[PDB]
């Protein structure tokens with residue numbers, strides 16, 4: 001079905017732990033895509049074989065304009081290859097480094113797109129649990145696309161930087177869909193401020209800040225944004241709103257966009 005000889009490899013798009021993502025073109029069709037090349041050796045050492053299977057499993061079956069498509073996979077003596085949809089406008093992570101922070105209109109638009117993709121996800125009992133600017137890509141029309149379903153499981157189940165994880169997850173407790181709603185609040189804050197609300201110079205300190213829900217808003221954050229973020233950043237998961245409530249929030253409806 002799939003072999004490396006079917007693709008013309010180009011520019012690297014990302015580099016990491018387990019391997020790199022390259023721009024590639026399918027020889028037969030001239031289809032431009034992104035090839036994630038992971039190394040078996042590293043995947044074995046970390047014991048992430050289950051997570052990679054779940055990524056493949058989940059992303060090949062999901063169909064949504066705000067969720068990155070996985071077209072297929074293959075492997076060789078030492079590498080596993082994922083055939084991904086290529087997002088041309090890069091990561092939201094990179095966009096935020098370049099603009100420093102986003103205006104309300106851009107933020108509300110991204111939050112709408114994310115919430116729609118998460119409603120679709122949750123309606124198939126899939127919980128992402130790893131929403132962060134590095135896992136959010138931008139399509140050709142600048143539309144947000146969720147990318148790495150590796151840490152996603154079927155709710156209610158039971159690590160790098162803690163910045164986007166909720167208290168129930170960092171404490172090792174039982175968690176469900178509401179975990180993605182906390183992540184949304186962290187992202188909405190970071191989009192407007194330029195830094196996540198529980199950021200610190202150490203993991204130990206970030207853990208304290210998250211478990212204690214210790215965030216303060218700078219002067220430029222409007223009351224509407226402060227209301228949505230405060231509602232999302234609740235210690236009690238049941239106290240967090242539903243995704244419908246988020247899409248209908250007056251700050252969202254007043255600043256977002258529609259097709």
Ligand SMILES: Nc1nc(Nc2ccc(S(N)(=O)=O)cc2)nn1C(=O)c1c(F)cccc1F
Pocket residue numbers: 013014015021022034036068084085086087088089090091094134135136137147148
């Ligand atoms: N599938 C996907 N497409 C892209 N697009 C892309 C386009 C431009 C740039 S940039 N501004 O040049 O550095 C970067 C990426 N990334 N990609 C990925 O899986 C991917 C990811 F999720 C996270 C990190 C890196 C990736 F590579």
